Amino acid sequence: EVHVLCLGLDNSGKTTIINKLKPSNAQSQDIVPTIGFSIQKFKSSSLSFTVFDMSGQGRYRNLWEHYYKEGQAIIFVIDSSDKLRMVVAKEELRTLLNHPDIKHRRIPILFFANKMDLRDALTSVKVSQLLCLEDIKDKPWHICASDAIKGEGLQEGVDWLQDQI
C-alpha cells in the first residue's frame, strides 16, 4: 500500500534495518543486504505499510536511481559512522528528491540517521538537519529516532513521516 524506500551510504554494509523494521513473524538473524526490490507487508507507526529496498555501491548506486521516481510514501536513511563517505551522501537527496517525480507529490519525504550503538554518530535528523542540509522544508516531512541494529526509533519522525500519512 504505502511503500518505503531507503538507500544508504557506500562501503558501509549499513543495510540491515529493514529486517528489524519488518514484523516479528519473519524476523531475520542474518545481516539483511540492501538488495532492494523487497516485497512485504509490515505494521509501521501509522498502519501496515509497504517497503522497497536498494543497494548503494558507488558503482551500484544507480538502481536506486532507477526506482527513484516512484513510491506510495517515502523513506530516509544515512550512514552516521561515515567521516569521509558522508560527503557523497550529501548529493543523494538532490539525486533522489531534486528529480521531478519526487517533487511533484506530497507524500512522505524524509532522510534519517543510523549507527547509534556504533561508536560514532551525529545529530538525530542527520540527513535533513546535521550536514547543513536543513533546507529540506518543502519536502512534506522530517525524519528521526535512530539506533544501530537493536531496533529503536522508527517511530521518531513518525508525526512528520509515518503518522503524517
Binding site: 562501503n11 555501491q57 558507488g58 558503482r59
Partner: protein, 85 residues
C-alpha cells in the same frame, strides 16, 4: 598509460606529458598543463594527472582534459578507490 590495449603514459621533466604506447608507439604528446604536471594519477578508466598551479587535473588518453580544476593547493599523490570501467 593503463589502456586496456596497453598504451603507456610518461611524464616529462618539462611538464609536457607524452603518450608513448606499447613498443614506443607514436602518439601525439599532450602538453596539457600550464605549470609542471608532476601529479599523474590513475583513475580506473584513464590516467589522472595533477596540474602544478593549484589546478585539479582531469584527462583521458586522447589529450582532452576531462576534469576542471578542483584543488586549492598543490597536490602530491592522487589515487582512486573501487568502481568499474
Amino acid at each position: 598509460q593503463f589502456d586496456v590495449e596497453f598504451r603507456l603514459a610518461a611524464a616529462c621533466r618539462n611538464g609536457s606529458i607524452y603518450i608513448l604506447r606499447r613498443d614506443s608507439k607514436r602518439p601525439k604528446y599532450c602538453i596539457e598543463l600550464g605549470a609542471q604536471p608532476v601529479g599523474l594519477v590513475g583513475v580506473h578508466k584513464v590516467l589522472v594527472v595533477g596540474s602544478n598551479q593549484d589546478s585539479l587535473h582531469g584527462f583521458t588518453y586522447k589529450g582532452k582534459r576531462l576534469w576542471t580544476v578542483q584543488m586549492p593547493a598543490a597536490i602530491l599523490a592522487m589515487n582512486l578507490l573501487e568502481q568499474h570501467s
